[PDB]
Design a protein around this ligand. Sequence first.
Ligand SMILES: [Cu+2]
Ligand SMILES: [Cu+2]
Ligand SMILES: [Cu+2]
Ligand SMILES: [Cu+2]
Ligand SMILES: [Cu+2]
Ligand SMILES: [Cu+2]
Ligand SMILES: [Cu+2]
Ligand SMILES: [Cu+2]
Ligand SMILES: [Cu+2]
Lengths: 272, 276, 271
Amino acid sequence: GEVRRIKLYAERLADGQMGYGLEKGRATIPGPLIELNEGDTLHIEFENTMDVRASLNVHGLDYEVSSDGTTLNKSDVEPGGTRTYTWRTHAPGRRSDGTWRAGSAGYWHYHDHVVGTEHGTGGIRKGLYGPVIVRRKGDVLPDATHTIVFNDMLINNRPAHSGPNFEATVGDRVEFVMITHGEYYHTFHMHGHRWADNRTGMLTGPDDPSQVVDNKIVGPADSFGFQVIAGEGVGAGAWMYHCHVQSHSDMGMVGLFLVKKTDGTIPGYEPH
Amino acid sequence: GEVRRIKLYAERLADGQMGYGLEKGRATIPGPLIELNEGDTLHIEFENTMDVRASLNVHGLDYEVSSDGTTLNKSDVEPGGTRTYTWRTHAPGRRSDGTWRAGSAGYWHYHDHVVGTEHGTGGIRKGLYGPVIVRRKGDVLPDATHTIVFNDMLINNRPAHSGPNFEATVGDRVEFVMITHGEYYHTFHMHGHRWADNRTGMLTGPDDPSQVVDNKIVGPADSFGFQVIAGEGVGAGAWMYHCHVQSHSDMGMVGLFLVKKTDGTIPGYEPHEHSG
Amino acid sequence: GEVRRIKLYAERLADGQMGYGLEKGRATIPGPLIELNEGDTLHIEFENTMDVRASLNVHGLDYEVSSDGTTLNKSDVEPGGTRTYTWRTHAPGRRSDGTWRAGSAGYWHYHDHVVGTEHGTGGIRKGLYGPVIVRRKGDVLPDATHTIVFNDMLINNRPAHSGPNFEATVGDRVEFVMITHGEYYHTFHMHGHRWADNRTGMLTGPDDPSQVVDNKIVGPADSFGFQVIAGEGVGAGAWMYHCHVQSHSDMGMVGLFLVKKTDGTIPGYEP
Ligand SMILES: [Cu+2]
Ligand SMILES: [Cu+2]
Ligand SMILES: [Cu+2]
Ligand SMILES: [Cu+2]
Ligand SMILES: [Cu+2]
Ligand SMILES: [Cu+2]
Ligand SMILES: [Cu+2]
Ligand SMILES: [Cu+2]
Ligand SMILES: [Cu+2]
């Protein structure tokens, strides 16, 4: 695999949240999607532009303790500081003991681990999280990828009942990365669509016995993903996605997957 | 598959509850079990007999936004009104991009989406939910199917400490459909029995790596199901199922799977004293 | 499989705690690891040394109602009493009707069912729980097995911020059994290591579609386990494991997997 390099900056946002960006002044919440193929190495030249200590910690991928992003492993970044974090990945294969070593591929995420507390409770609450996809050779690639983060009671830190909404055309392969943070369990639900509860969100064939679900319980720092064919068997329309914990949806943990016809039109709907 | 048609009614029930039924005055909580084979279409002629808008939304099955049963899609039903919902299903198959399209088969459920709030919070609380099983060709069919709904701190909206209990005889192939609703997470456990955490609850063969469990965390709107051979390897008796969150079980989220010997009896079952 | 016999005791410990042990005065929380192979039968001669009734209930394994360990099935133990519980286990196989019967193998656990309430709420809170592993023929055996119990907001009933920590050398095959109890859901997370969300925690080979995770939601009475190669592709170090529920990790539900180089050293850490 490739040796890759990116720049990342942690920035306080003008509304007082915090976010990672590929350029100065271009921070988003969630942070930018990082995509790698198993075997790729990624060196992230990270700069903490804030006036508090901040770090970068990744789930699932291979890193040494010097890229833990923790105070425990002396690998957080002082205010205005820089640090190069290195993520590695490996393909699956047979160990000499006969057992099978699981590859890095999966739907993963990165987050701050020092803002607020030694577990990143404040950086997480403020926005310092983002998605990482590690692909296996042969994995099917999508038309679009959309990241949905249930961070305490907000989606992608948006106010109640304020999306995000994602648009697609009927028939598109659409990938969703679904990450959870904070204090609460949630249940992720999409109307109109369903996926397999396995690595890729898709059944490998008729012999794959994976649960096919449209609703999935998640807790802080869980991540999974899937791909659907937009509107498959169900048509164009505004397909809600939402936490299914009753008060959480009532409180605004709801967005719309807007699946349009190939003429760009959608059946009329009446949003909040 | 085949085109099927049923009538369904939503009605108020005593004590502030609401339910679906196949005929007026026969609503139940949970609502009627709907069972389809992959490829079947079901048209439900739904009548809302209540004085507030109500709907039917289903998980897992195929439906267009005109049968979403949501305010968003203007597909709920006014007081006294009727609407025909359509649920479709499909078998799995290979797509022209080379991927495998997952079939409709599974343990699913339907519920109201507009009573109380535009997420049906009031209607689900009150009893407007029921089970839907879609079978795949070749699926093994059970001797009996029992539905267990954890709705907040109640089972099937029954008073705390009131079951339900289900009976079977050793060797029967008993299916359970387990649905959760409301605000709380739970952990569903059964004494003496275990199942696979996969589509059918049964391992497919020696090649199926699915987890074998007797305890499963669930949250609002999760549904799963399984079949067990009653008493297999463990014999007759009163086998508890309960939520394993400790205060939940202590507050009464418990029921009995009552497994009889083939002679009719349940060991240890002594409801009555004896002289002497 | 073989017939095995053991003794087990329930005792009070300090601080109003209660524990199971394989010898008097040797109760521990979690209780002793019990390991069987599918087919084995285990007869446990259990003595309740305490002054309240107590019992032994197990998840996963085959038992008759006489060993349910509940008041419902008249199988708890009077103060100072003794009872022999029997656990059986079976291999997987095909039924006469061609359906596949799942085996007893997995990562399971035993606990009291009558202390405090008829669901063992106080017995669990106070420490009456432990791990059982049932192995399948051909399963790989580890170098060490560590048990991590999330019991409400404590790990293994230990005070906040007091581990437990577990040590290995780079390359050791280390097995974890993770059991949760009480009132709360948690998410179990381990730095620098991952596992398959299936029975063994290891993929069966190139066809097994199980998700590979490093973070897993669990609730009361859930149990799972896995093996890793310590430090694989990431090296020696102080690798945290913790609940990832943010207040729970802030309140001290954290431990270290201390993975040492072969010369016994470990990159300097800041606990
Ligand atoms: Cu961490
Ligand atoms: Cu939620
Ligand atoms: Cu994390
Ligand atoms: Cu909905
Ligand atoms: Cu519960
Ligand atoms: Cu729903
Ligand atoms: Cu129990
Ligand atoms: Cu926790
Ligand atoms: Cu239990």
